[PDB]
Amino acid sequence: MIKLCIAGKNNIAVNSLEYILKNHFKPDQVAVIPNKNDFGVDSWQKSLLHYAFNNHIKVITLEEAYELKQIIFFSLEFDRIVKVEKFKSDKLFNMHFSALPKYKGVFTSITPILNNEVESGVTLHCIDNGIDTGNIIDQYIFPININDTARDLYFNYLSYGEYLFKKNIQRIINNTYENFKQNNISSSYFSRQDININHKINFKKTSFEIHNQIRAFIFKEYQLPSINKTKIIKSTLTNEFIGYNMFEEFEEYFMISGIDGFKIIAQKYN
Amino acid sequence: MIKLCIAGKNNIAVNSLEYILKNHFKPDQVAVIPNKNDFGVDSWQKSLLHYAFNNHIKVITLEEAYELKQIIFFSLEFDRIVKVEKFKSDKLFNMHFSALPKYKGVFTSITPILNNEVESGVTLHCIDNGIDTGNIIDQYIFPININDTARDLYFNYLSYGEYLFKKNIQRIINNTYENFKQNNISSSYFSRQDININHKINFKKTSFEIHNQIRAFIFKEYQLPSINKTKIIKSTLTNEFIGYNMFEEFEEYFMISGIDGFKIIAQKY
Numbered sequence: 001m002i003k004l005c006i007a008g009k010n011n012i013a014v015n016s017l018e019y020i021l022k023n024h025f026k027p028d029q030v031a032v033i034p035n036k037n038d039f040g041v042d043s044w045q046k047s048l049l050h051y052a053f054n055n056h057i058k059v060i061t062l063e064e065a066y067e068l069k070q071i072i073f074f075s076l077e078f079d080r081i082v083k084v085e086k087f088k089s090d091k092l093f094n095m096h097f098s099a100l101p102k103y104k105g106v107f108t109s110i111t112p113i114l115n116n117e118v119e120s121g122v123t124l125h126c127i128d129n130g131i132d133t134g135n136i137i138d139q140y141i142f143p144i145n146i147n148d149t150a151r152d153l154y155f156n157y158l159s160y161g162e163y164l165f166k167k168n169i170q171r172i173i174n175n176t177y178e179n180f181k182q183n184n185i186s187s188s189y190f191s192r193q194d195i196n197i198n199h200k201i202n203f204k205k206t207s208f209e210i211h212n213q214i215r216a217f218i219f220k221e222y223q224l225p226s227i228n229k230t231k232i233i234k235s236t237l238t239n240e241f242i243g244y245n246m247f248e249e250f251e252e253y254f255m256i257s258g259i260d261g262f263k264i265i266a267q268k269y270n
Numbered sequence: 271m272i273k274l275c276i277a278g279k280n281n282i283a284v285n286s287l288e289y290i291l292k293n294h295f296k297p298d299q300v301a302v303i304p305n306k307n308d309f310g311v312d313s314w315q316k317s318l319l320h321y322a323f324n325n326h327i328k329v330i331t332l333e334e335a336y337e338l339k340q341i342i343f344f345s346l347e348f349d350r351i352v353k354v355e356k357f358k359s360d361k362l363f364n365m366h367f368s369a370l371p372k373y374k375g376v377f378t379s380i381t382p383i384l385n386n387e388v389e390s391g392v393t394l395h396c397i398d399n400g401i402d403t404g405n406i407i408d409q410y411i412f413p414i415n416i417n418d419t420a421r422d423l424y425f426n427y428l429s430y431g432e433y434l435f436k437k438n439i440q441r442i443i444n445n446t447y448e449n450f451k452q453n454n455i456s457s458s459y460f461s462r463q464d465i466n467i468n469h470k471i472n473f474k475k476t477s478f479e480i481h482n483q484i485r486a487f488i489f490k491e492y493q494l495p496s497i498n499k500t501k502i503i504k505s506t507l508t509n510e511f512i513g514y515n516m517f518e519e520f521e522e523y524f525m526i527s528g529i530d531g532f533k534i535i536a537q538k539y
Contacts, residue, residue: 102386104476104529115385116372116458130514133530146455184509184532185416187476188386194474202464206374206457239454244400259374260403262454 005065006048007033008078012095012158014046016076016165021055024173031060035079044221045158072172075127076161082127092127093172094134095165097157099141100125101187104132109150109157111190113216116209118144120153122161124168126179131189135179138168147236149218197223203247207262211237214266224269227254231269238263272328275335277303278346280315282365282428286346286435287321294443301330305349314491315428342442345397346431353399362397363442364404365435367427369411370395371457374402377465379420379427383486384469386479388414390423392431394438396449401459405449408438417506419488467493473515477532481507484536494539497524501539508533 003025006017013032020030032052040049052059062080065073069088076095084092097108099121105111112120121141126134140160144153171177201213214235217225224231228249239262246257254266273295276287283302290300302322310319322329335343336356345352345364354362367378369391375381382390391411396404410430414423441447471483484505487495494501498519510533518525524536 101476101530116456118456130531131529182530184476184478184507184530186386186388187478187530187532189474189476189479189529191474194472204459204461204463206371206454206459208454208457209459237454244403259401259459260371260452260454260457261400262457 001029002031002060002068002071003029004072004074005031005033005060005068006074006076007062007065007080007082008074008076009035009038009048010045010077010158012161012165013048013076014051015162016074016169017048017051017055017057019162019166019169021057024169027055027057031058031065033060033062033065033078033080035077037079073127074165076165084127084129091172091175093137094125094127094132095161096123096125096132097154097161098123098132099139100132100136101182101184104187104189105194106190106192107195108190109154109219110195110216112144113148113150113153113212114195116212118146120144120157122157122164124164125182133182135181137172137177137179138164140164147215147234149215149234151219151221154219197225201225201227203245203256203258205258206260207237207256207258207264208260210256210258211235211264214264227266232266233269234265234267236265236267238265271299272301272330272338272341273299274342274344275301275303275330275338276318276344276346277332277335277350277352278344278348279305279308279318280347280428282431282435283318283346284316284321285432286344286439287318287325287327289432289436289439291325294439297326298328301328301335303330303332303335303348305347307349343397344435346435351401352397354397354404355399361442361445362404363407364395364397364402365431366393366395366402367424367431368393368402369409370402370406371452371454374457374459375461375464377460377462379424379489380465380467380486381460382414383418383420383423383482384465386482388416390414390427392427392434394434395452403452405451407442407447407449408434410434417485417504419485419505421489421491424489469495471495471497473517473526473528475528476530477507477526477528477534478530480526480528481505481534484534497526497536502536503539504535504537506535506537 038049066086071089072091100123123139124137128134241261242263244261248255256264308319341359343362370393394408398404514531516527526534
């Protein structure tokens with residue numbers, strides 16, 4: 001019988017399924033639910049369907065998952081809403097890519113950078129009927145490096161999320177894991193409508209903030225930000241003082257400072 | 271000769287000047303530059319002009335202060351741009367109402383609450399040619415309590431600001447203080463144009479965040495926020511689950527929750 005379902009995508013889904021098959025369940029005891037854009041081709045991330053092809057793991061639909069009493073269900077970067085009322089099983093887990101209770105919702109590779117954080121996290125939680133509201137099982141807090149793009153923070157979510165999955169899976173299978181209610185204080189949330197790539201950069205800000213407004217949108221597979229109609233592939237914040245409110249376009253880059261005068265190098269796409 | 275000038279307003283300016291007169295300098299060695307809002311009338315804060323009147327302290331212009339060699343210049347809630355480059359003296363100090371390098375600029379009773387902080391601070395710093403950018407001398411970080419309004423936060427800034435002034439003024443007079451360059455990382459800035467004090471509440475947020483959007487604008491001498499054209503005087507957030515995205519209007523209050531379902535009581539004026 002199916003004991004465990006992985007729903008989602010990318011190295012976190014693939015490497016977590018590999019760990020299950022090495023350590024916990026036989027191929028016939030596991031199923032995958034792919035994202036809508038998985039076409040079995042490994043690229044900047046591994047394809048869950050390609051892993052399932054090589055390893056003869058079966059696919060189920062979300063509607064089939066609903067009916068399997070006792071299944072352990074994990075969303076790992078899943079692209080569909082998990083409706084807890086629809087499931088017979090109450091063993092439903094999500095790896096949310098933030099330090100809950102902060103940054104519930106979407107685009108968590110963008111929102112902590114845009115909001116001037118120097119740390120993020122991954123949180124393994126129970127799925128309940130709210131958006132990323134369920135009880136925490138475990139959390140890993142880690143730094144946002146000063147020149148990380150959204151893409152760099154995303155790759156860190158994938159690594160630490162895989163780490164939390166492997167750390168907690170035995171206690172989840174044994175049903176010996178502890179879970180705690182999320183705090184109401186410091187709880188934050190961003191919807192799709194709260195993120196706008198086309199939003200003009202506000203230059204009447206610190207160098208840190210101008211740099212954040214650029215690098216939060218650097219994720220080349222999805223998009224790059226623009227300055228004066230040129231795409232930017234990298235932003236570098238220095239602590240060199242070059243004077244307040246500087247802006248100079250060079251052949252390959254922009255030199256920028258905000259209200260505190262620290263030099264930003266914004267590298268042009270070429 | 272004038273040894274010290276206090277430029278600014280409110281209890282922080284008046285209490286700091288009193289401390290100077292009791293502990294450091296004679297009335298004829300001090301001057302004030304009041305804010306444009308100072309009409310010499312005590313209200314919900316004391317008037318610096320009124321104190322100066324009663325204590326025979328001279329009012330000078332900013333242009334005069336620029337030409338006074340050796341003056342200690344202290345901005346405490348001053349309402350004009352000060353830039354070292356204009357002054358003969360280099361002894362220029364500001365009490366900024368945030369935990370610098372965060373929340374440079376204005377409306378710092380609003381910005382930390384609105385940006386989901388649980389702490390703020392006061393920072394004694396050197397004034398340079400940028401906005402709240404000069405080297406840090408001392409800092410005191412204190413909690414934002416969960417139901418604090420902008421008004422509660424402002425009164426804490428006045429209190430902790432006065433504390434940091436009295437702690438540091440002897441070493442500033444003796445020129446034995448240390449200063450440190452502000453970090454480039456975590457530096458943030460808000461201008462007058464970045465805050466709409468007619469803030470429209472985004473309800474597609476957590477209870478903590480809805481509560482923040484209300485309480486950040488509760489400062490009755492300036493404004494109260496409105497829900498459904500009704501002024502709000504108090505917001506109270508608890509960890510009681512009442513359901514997601516609740517909004518119930520009672521005669522005297524609103525019970526509200528955001529995406530995470532925690533109870534807010536917003537009390538009507």
